[PDB]
Amino acid sequence: PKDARHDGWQTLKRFLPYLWPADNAVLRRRVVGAILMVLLGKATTLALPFAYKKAVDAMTLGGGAQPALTVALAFVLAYALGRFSGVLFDNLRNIVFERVGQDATRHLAENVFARLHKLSLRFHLARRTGEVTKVIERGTKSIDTMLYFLLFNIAPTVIELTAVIVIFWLNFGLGLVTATILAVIAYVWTTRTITEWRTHLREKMNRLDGQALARAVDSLLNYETVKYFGAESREEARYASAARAYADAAVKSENSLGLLNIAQALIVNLLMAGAMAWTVYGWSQGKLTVGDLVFVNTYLTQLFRPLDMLGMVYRTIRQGLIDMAEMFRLIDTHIEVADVPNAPALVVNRPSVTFDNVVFGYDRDREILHGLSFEVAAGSRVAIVGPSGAGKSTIARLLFRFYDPWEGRILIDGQDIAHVTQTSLRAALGIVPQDSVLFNDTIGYNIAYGRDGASRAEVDAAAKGAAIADFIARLPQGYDTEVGERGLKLSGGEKQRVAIARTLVKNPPILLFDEATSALDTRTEQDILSTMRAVASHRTTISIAHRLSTIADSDTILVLDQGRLAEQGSHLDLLRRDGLYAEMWARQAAESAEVSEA
């Protein structure tokens, strides 16, 4: 299976079930019809040169223009109709097959999409929208062009080349056969080597192009700064040098295309000269008719027409196979966090959260939690704080099981979250993260995202609870207002309110505020804190905060130091104990004073 050479053959054999689905009957029928079109088309293009030969034969055999006019007429007509029929068959196979192609590449993409959602967070999917888009565009284009060239150029040419070998064998040579075979081998080898060199030149050109373009764009988007320093000539010279470098590379890349074409024509035309001279010589001895000259010439040109593109074809097919392999690699990549076999659903009857001796790090060379243990009572409002090495920033990710502990475990109610389904576990948890993100869609879509079947009543209710309802009401399109980019831009508080609303639609027993106010300004922070407190009403709530004053009203505060639970208690108990929390508090307090001094 996967236990193979990992060449194009493996990738292709892997792709084969997509083309011959065994899910879909209609598509299989389409495949068969396309293959029939290939065969009819080839039979037609192989037959038509014979008709041309006979027409010439009739006009040379040959005392006069006698009953032979009728014969010659019939045969040229057969030839022309043959040409049209060949093209008709080719275009009909493309037309029949196209749906199969489209479904196959769609299903491949969907499989990759699904596996990517199953894969680990640590792949760190944080990148540029335009760049990933450019990569995906280039790649889909790649796989499509490859697929088309393999099925509809290379394969028909293999059939045709074999047929020409047999026919040339039975009717000529067999010096003809070896001559053509050598011509084809020299042709492919030359095209291949020249193409490898060409692909390198292309890559250099593409890079230089990107550089000239980047300079131009950076300049235009910094028009103000350029004016401030009167730097127009400078930026112009800067674009110009880059542009020249690009143009030089482009001239080389294109010229190499000229060289490939010339090499190809040399090979074809040596073959043509040889075949035709030899055919004429065979004519002189009465072995071959004059029509044979026409016949061989047509067979050779027809054979070498698809090979006119072989370079591009080669490049394309190669790249496609690469890209497709990349796809399959993702599908194969193993999943770090998985449900255990026959994992039960998590049943939340009493929403306690337990960390039991948790040892964890994102990477095995940097341990962060060194045996963290704590208990959060059901329905309590708890805070988790600490200085720079505490490891509090792992809590949310562990609770949602983005990762597993190296040692120890997390429990919700009485149950190890590692032994339940990921879906039930996440169904029980709400989060308002530090940087809330909006989908490129309406505000209603964004709020309703909290639960799958969320009704507009639920959206209104959540928006009310998050106290963002009025702001939406004063929008012309209300809930149907598009947001994100390209959409309406929300303030930080408005975004955090959309996130809160989203979690309200979910209505989870356990709610986490994960540095929820850390990006907000002071007034925004203070405003949203009453909403958060209200929204924590009958939930078990865990708030991870940098700034202690924002969580001082907690039922209890867990203080972490060096990946372990250092101190525990109410804000007052902790101030009395005069330990780490008190120091932190004093420190922050002092700092708040200093800023106010200015």
Added chain:
Amino acid sequence: NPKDARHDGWQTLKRFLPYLWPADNAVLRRRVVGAILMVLLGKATTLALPFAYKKAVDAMTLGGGAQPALTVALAFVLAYALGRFSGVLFDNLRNIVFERVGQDATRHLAENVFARLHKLSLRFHLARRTGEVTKVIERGTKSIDTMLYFLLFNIAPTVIELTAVIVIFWLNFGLGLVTATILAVIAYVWTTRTITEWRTHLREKMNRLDGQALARAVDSLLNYETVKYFGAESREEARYASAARAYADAAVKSENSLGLLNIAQALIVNLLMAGAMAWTVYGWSQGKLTVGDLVFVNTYLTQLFRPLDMLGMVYRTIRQGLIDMAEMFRLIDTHIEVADVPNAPALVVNRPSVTFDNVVFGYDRDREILHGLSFEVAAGSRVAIVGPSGAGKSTIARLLFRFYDPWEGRILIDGQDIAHVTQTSLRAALGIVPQDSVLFNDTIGYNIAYGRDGASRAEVDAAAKGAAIADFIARLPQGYDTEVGERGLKLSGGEKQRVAIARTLVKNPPILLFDEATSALDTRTEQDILSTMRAVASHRTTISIAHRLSTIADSDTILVLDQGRLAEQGSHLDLLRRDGLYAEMWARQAAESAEVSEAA
């Protein structure tokens, strides 16, 4: 005037022609001539080679006077093969010879537009998204290149060959042959064009559906965490799938139409082939034509219609190219709001005073902001300009750098109207630390050296020191060679502002503007950077435009604007004593900070 004409493809091409025939270079003109010569050799060759095939066939079938016919036929078969190879050689040689001319032409067009865009007004607000603009420019470049290649190396050669075939068919056949082929070419072009219009519309729909499916997929992938938090994997999968199906449907229709165009084309071509060949054989029957004539006619027709096999695509590309190029020329034609007057002298700053003399201005003609603003900034003084929300203070710097001109009134530096001097000297006299400094996608050292064209490593080190960012840079692993901006290391607000300060230090202008320089900063960063700003403002004329009065309280004098005019002027203490607009503002601002300080 060539611009005084209909706005079509012909005009665009006529505009582009000087680029191809520079009259600056001569080397390139010689290259163009050489390329045209290769077109002619190539056409003579491809026209000549079928006669060689014809003769070879003629020799074999009429060996009466063409003897030894084996020798004659061999010679002709070899002439035919050599003719083919030679045709290809001539064609690739015209491409190879011309390519430099093409690249230079399009480079010069791009450079012309680039210069023009830097000349055009700020109000166009060119700052927009990088990826979108880049994708557009890539698409356009490919478009114009492809158009140029198809125009020069496909359409034009085919026009030459078509005329030649018409003449040759005329002289040796028909002339039913001539009319048949011409009608065929006409039917071919008309069919291809009309089918291509439909095809292009389908292509656009396909592309739009493609972009929507891709955007859904990308939004999901970059929001993997959110998708996880809400268990939305199935929803995202289904949401991608529906879009993907819409795209696949569009793609299927779009590809299928290509099959239709190919069939229509082959139908036309093959009617012409059947008729022409049948006619040639019938002419043979009457002793009018040789059998080699059949080979000759057939070969001529296939050679003719081979470039036309691409006519659909060609038509789509050339058209698109012509559109894109027109857009280029449109930008080049767009007029320049702010230009130097003819023969403008340099601004000569011997004593760097600044005057606003009765200035009336607005960004737009329906909304006037300054209503007769007048003030004098003494040479070497440090002054501030403050006011409430409609004061118009945010126009001052833009007017000084002459991003816009006054509707009425004028601005002077050292007694010289800045409207009447070269823009480059004027801007040479001015330094600015703006509210949001922007960095080039380049090294931090490049960004600092940007202050002056020939900036040495020493000048940069000195500026980094004066801006007090030198230590921060020293602690960078790559130092001055550290890449910054987007696509690079992220600097804090203070670090960026310090880079801006360092830039102006490298420039060393006589007049310095702080244009809300500290307004985006946090309080402590503001307090830190203010001492730096005071140091660099040492012996310069400094004008500080600030929202928060406490940051400018130490000014030599303060200009208070209200409603686009100068309401109040004087020292901070004098303004507090007058108990007017500045005092009110001062009190108000103090009050707010107190309340803010209260909320700890």
